[PDB]
């Protein structure tokens, strides 16, 4: 019954042999990015309470924001106009997703229900297309693979693929032993990686339903998880105050992004289009740009009065939005 | 100013949405949010006369009380959300001495929590009637569950309800002092515990909350208005 410990060292020694060099010696000759100064370009002031989640549309002009007051507002970032304001049944909404099509948005929180909202009805009102029930814990994150499929993480230690039309869970991912706090879909959408309070990040296969690879670097809850644009590496934020790049093919950590001054946890993590910059929101009321290859802080987006809860980079890569408990979502170009 | 007929209409739509959001802001600001933390057998369900959400009104002030029983285990992840509530209403069953040490650990976790560091607690020792019956009956000794009780003496400042045996008064104040000891130990004045002895029969618990939330907001206002 302890063969599991034998398998555990076997996995460890296989990773040890593979890690011949460090990402930092390989990129030691690469010339750094240089200080990155990003000024706030837009400030969106529509939410009464703390902002917990934001998602960018494929167009990179529309963005949906969630607040603890119980409202989702779609913003035309370019003109700072409020396209739609959705009243929500539960005041507590911890996540918000935007469909790739733009036809639907989703939100979830302590309700334990993922509500999908049809933005484009003929009646002209935003109505809840479907309510998804089955998570026995808060829905920490949700991302739409398509208009009829959504992958939702939960505090019940289970993530789930749901067919929206049926309302049923096509697949359930039960490997984690701790509340899953974040999920990131790969660009291909074939595999998603989810980070839990078990200080472990697990890669899944949406089609198969199983955990392909488990990554164990952090010392505390993995608050955020982002996929590198290539779809072969991912970056995890944790209360450990450390961000850790992993490589799916090497099945091990490539680098760590920690500063001695930085001691607060990382609420959110994102990568720019080129994947060179690893933005990361911290509870110090500021976000810190990191050169992913060089592991060097290369900038700071300090314009917030409270915890930065969410950070998102437009698909185009033109801008970075940063929600915060101050109730102001700021766009940084 | 260089805005198309459709851009101007979109700006109007945004302004209409903004006015609705302002009407909502007034309701949100008027509502005082309270986190009903507690455990089963506390009786937290019936502390106020009026399960996740309950709305009352005292002196034309509306209070929203949230009981998040949906998620268990470490409550740390979901407590971060309620870092803006006016005051946590902790409810403890005085009768259950065995679970009382479990209750004192939850208070310590909540009082010393990173996000609830400025949130005052309105502790409500409930089922004081049960505790009185057990103390009078015997059989169950608060000394057995907690050794410090035999040394304890009723506080001189303590005011006893009429006719209450001195031992019942001593027991009630021993339970209260354990919760107070945790509060006094790790507080910078940022928040305070308001301990109130209550029973299932008592219907004055809504008034108690009113008076204690008036003190929390008062002390916050005093600092906010740069007076203290």
């Amino acid at each position, epitope marked *: 019954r302890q063969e599991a410990e034998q398998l555990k060292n076997q996995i460890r020694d296989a990773r040890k042999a593979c890690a011949d060099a460090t990402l930092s010696q390989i990129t030691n000759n690469i010339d750094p990015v240089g200080r990155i100064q990003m000024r706030t370009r837009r400030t969106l002031r529509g939410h009464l309470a703390k902002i917990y989640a934001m998602h960018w549309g494929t167009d990179s*002009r*529309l963005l949906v924001s969630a607040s603890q007051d119980g409202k989702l507002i779609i913003w*035309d970032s370019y*003109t700072t*106009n409020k*396209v*739609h304001a959705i009243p929500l049944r539960s005041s507590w909404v911890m996540t918000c997703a935007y469909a790739p099509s*733009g036809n639907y948005v989703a939100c979830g929180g302590l309700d334990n229900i993922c509500s999908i909202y049809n933005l*484009k009805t*003929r*009646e*002209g*009102n935003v109505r809840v297309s479907r309510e998804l029930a089955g998570h026995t814990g808060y829905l920490s994150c949700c991302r739409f693979l398509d208009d009829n499929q959504i992958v939702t993480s939960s505090g019940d230690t289970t993530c789930a693929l749901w067919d929206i039309e049926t309302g049923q869970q096509t697949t359930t991912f039960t490997g984690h032993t701790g509340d899953v706090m974040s999920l990131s879909l790969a660009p291909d959408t074939r595999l998603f990686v989810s980070g839990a309070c078990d200080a472990s990040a697990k890669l899944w296969d949406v089609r198969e339903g199983m955990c392909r690879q488990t990554f164990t670097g952090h010392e505390s809850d993995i608050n955020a998880i982002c996929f590198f644009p290539n779809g072969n590496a991912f970056a995890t934020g944790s209360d450990d105050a450390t961000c850790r790049l992993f490589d799916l093919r090497a099945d091990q950590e490539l680098m760590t992004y920690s500063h001695d001054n930085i001691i607060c946890g990382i609420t959110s993590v994102s990568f720019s289009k080129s994947g060179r910059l690893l933005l990361a929101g911290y509870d110090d009321f500021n976000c810190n740009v990191w050169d992913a290859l060089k592991a060097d802080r290369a900038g700071v987006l300090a314009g917030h009065d409270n915890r930065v809860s969410c950070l998102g980079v437009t698909d185009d890569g033109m801008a970075v939005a940063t929600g915060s408990w101050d109730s102001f979502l700021k766009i940084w170009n | 100013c*260089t805005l*198309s*007929a*459709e*851009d*101007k*209409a*979109a700006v*109007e*739509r945004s302004k*209409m949405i903004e006015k609705q959001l302002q009407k909502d802001k007034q309701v949100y600001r008027a509502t005082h949010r309270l986190l009903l933390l507690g455990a089963d057998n506390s009786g937290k369900s019936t502390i106020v006369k009026q399960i996740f959400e309950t709305k009352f009104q005292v002196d034309k002030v509306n209070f929203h009380m949230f009981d998040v029983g949906g998620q268990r285990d470490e409550r740390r992840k979901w407590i971060q959300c309620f870092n803006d509530v006016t005051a946590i209403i902790f409810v403890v069953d005085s009768s259950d001495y065995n679970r009382l040490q479990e209750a004192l650990n939850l208070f310590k976790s909540i009082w010393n929590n990173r996000w609830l560091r400025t949130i005052s607690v309105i502790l409500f020792l409930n089922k004081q009637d049960l505790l009185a019956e057990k103390v009078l009956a015997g059989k169950s000794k608060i000394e057995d569950y907690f050794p410090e009780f035999a040394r304890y003496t009723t506080p001189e400042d303590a005011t006893p309800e009429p006719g209450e045996d001195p031992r019942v008064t001593r027991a009630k104040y021993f339970i209260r002092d354990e919760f107070l000891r945790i509060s006094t130990a790790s507080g910078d004045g940022r928040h305070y515990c308001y301990p109130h002895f209550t029973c299932a029969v008592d219907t004055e618990n809504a008034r108690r909350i009113f008076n204690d939330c008036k003190d929390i907001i008062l002390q916050m206002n005093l600092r906010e208005y740069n007076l203290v």
Partner: single-chain antibody
Framework: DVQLVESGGGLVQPGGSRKLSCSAS????????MHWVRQAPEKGLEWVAY????????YYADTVKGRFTISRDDPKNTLFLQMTSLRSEDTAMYYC??????????????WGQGTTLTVSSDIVMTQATSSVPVTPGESVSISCRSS???????????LYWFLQRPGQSPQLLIY???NLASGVPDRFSGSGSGTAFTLTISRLEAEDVGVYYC?????????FGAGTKLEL
């Protein structure tokens, strides 16, 4: 379903006054700004008035300005046009059109059936071909021209195509020059050059027969073209 039935029209002696009432059912009337567009019996479409959601902006066509006033009862879901000093020119079928304006919205999406009234710096839309004979399975290119470039700085070309099938209310086909309205077959396509635009109807079907109107929304007064009939 979505409906904008309007009543209140009939024979009226000149200098008279009638109120036209569009009753909206099946949509959020308050959210959508409404417009009254009239079609003289032997002529084309002309924009009469615009009532914005919240009733905070009202625009009128110079021909009816002063004499006609447009109001909306949002609680009763009803649009009113109190027309006074009626002239013989006013005779026309009046259509109440809904228009929601948000980024990505399709304005002019739904038109009402129409109420008939019988009385006893404007951008100019030039549809050159009044008629174009066509047989099914062919591709036609109805073209419209504009006095000013409908392309704004925003990058949006505010040109809209509408098809009034015979005996039917006009229906949005193309919005903002290229975007195709919902429920609209893929055969239609909008191609434009700031000032000159063309609607390409491939594999024309017997459903396509009707008059095609090009309208500008760049500014008010909104101006429609004469129309181009497509006969089978």
């Amino acid at each position: 379903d979505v409906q904008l039935v309007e009543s209140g029209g009939g024979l009226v002696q000149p200098g008279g006054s009638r109120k036209l009432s569009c009753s909206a059912s099946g949509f959020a009337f308050s959210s959508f700004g409404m417009h009254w567009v009239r079609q003289a019996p032997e002529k084309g479409l002309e924009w009469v008035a615009y009532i914005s959601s919240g009733s905070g902006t009202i625009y009128y066509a110079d021909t009816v300005k002063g004499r006609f006033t447009i109001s909306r009862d949002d609680p009763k879901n009803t649009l009113f046009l109190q027309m006074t000093s009626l002239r013989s020119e006013d005779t026309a079928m009046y259509y109440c059109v809904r228009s929601i304006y948000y980024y990505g919205s399709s304005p002019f999406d739904f038109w009402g059936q129409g109420t008939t009234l019988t009385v006893s710096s404007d951008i100019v839309m030039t549809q050159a071909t009044s008629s174009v004979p066509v047989t099914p399975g062919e591709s036609v290119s109805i073209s419209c021209r504009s006095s000013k470039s409908l392309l704004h700085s925003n990058g949006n070309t505010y040109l809209y195509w509408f098809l009034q099938r015979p005996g039917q209310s006009p229906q949005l086909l193309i919005y903002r020059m290229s975007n195709l309205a919902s429920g609209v077959p893929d055969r239609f396509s909008g191609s434009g050059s700031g000032t000159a635009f063309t609607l390409t109807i491939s594999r024309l079907e017997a459903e396509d027969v009707g008059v095609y109107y090009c309208m500008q929304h760049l500014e008010y007064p909104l101006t429609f073209g004469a129309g181009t009939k497509l006969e089978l």
